Amino acid sequence: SLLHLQEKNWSALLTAVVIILTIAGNILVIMAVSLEKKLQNATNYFLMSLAIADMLLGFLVMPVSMLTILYGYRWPLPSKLCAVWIYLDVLFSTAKIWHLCAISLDRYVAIQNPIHHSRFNSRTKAFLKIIAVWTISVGISMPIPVFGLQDDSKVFKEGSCLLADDNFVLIGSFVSFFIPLTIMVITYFLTIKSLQKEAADLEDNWETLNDNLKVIEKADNAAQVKDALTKMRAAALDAGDILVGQIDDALKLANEGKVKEAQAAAEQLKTTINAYIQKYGQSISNEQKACKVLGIVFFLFVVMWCPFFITNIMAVICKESCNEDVIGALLNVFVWIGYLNSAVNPLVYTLFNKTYRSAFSRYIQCQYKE
Ligand SMILES: NCCc1c[nH]c2ccc(O)cc12
Ligand SMILES: [Mg+2]
């Protein structure tokens, strides 16, 4: 006889906590993007869809995962509900990683194509990209019901419902989890470098505009102002229209010979430059702030699923050499480290965004009026 309820009830109280923090955390994120209007961009739109994936993992996968621990890891439901539960577990995790990849991808293309980002601002464009990812994730996870329902040996390992098939655990791990992991760690690295270069390029054009504002207010002739405005106008085009015609206003005074009159115009440009420099120089500050926080989302996904990901692959490499009972007893812990990651995507936003933090606080006092 089997399917016995046991006294594994340290686990029952601990796993219940993780389910609510997932469900309550990611509901507040879905409510934040749906209601708060400082969050209406493509990156925050993905984070909602990430939190829909996290929350449905809290509803559908994590209670059943708890329920198995309550019946000694012998599987209490119907046997054709084993292959459904693996399919949802793997679908929500595959949808998370391909979101996290696609954010880091969409963020990088936003910097290399500033003009394209204005065109790609559309919520419809964002939703199309999400709907690309979910239908990729349903595409990748689809062997688990199509084959597993047909053969109980691919989803049961001795009354235990788990992905027993080893070509599913191997090929899936590299198709669905190092192809979008590669693209995430390449494009996060290059996003840091594109915002390092353009911050470094703005300090270049800060010091050459500030250098020619020394030159014009020293100068004697209309050739030492004309050249010095020609080097301002060229290196003001390198920060892109607003200021160029005001330099062209100053350029025609140097081209006629009105030097004291061209020098006075250049002093009027000074404050125009400090306005346009404090603006775009706070823009790079904000993107590098956002890139840092999205990195913590990216880093904690990778770290918390990493003990589950390595040990599941060591189940397949030492299929002979190792304690299958100990590897089975570690994966049962290691899956819940990765489940816990559904609870921490919301908490990150709270610590690191005052817009998410304010919104969460108001909803806890039941205040939706923005
Ligand atoms: N999401 C990976 C499949 C899965 C679901 N529950 C599990 C429990 C144990 C295990 O080894 C694997 C699983
Ligand atoms: Mg200098």
From Swiss-Prot:
* Chain location of the short sequence motif NPxxY motif per the record: 345-349
Principal localization?
membrane
Outcome following mutation: residue 85 to A/F: Decreased ability to bind serotonin and psilocybin
Q: Where is the signal peptide?
A: none
Other information: Binds lysergic acid diethylamine (LSD) in the orthosteric pocket. Bound LSD dissociates extremely slowly, with a residence time of about 221 minutes at 37 degrees Celsius.
Domains: entry comment: The PDZ domain-binding motif is involved in the interaction with PATJ, CASK, APBA1, DLG1 and DLG4.
Q: What is this protein called?
A: 5-hydroxytryptamine receptor 2A
Q: What range of the parent protein does this fragment cover?
A: 67 to 401 of 471
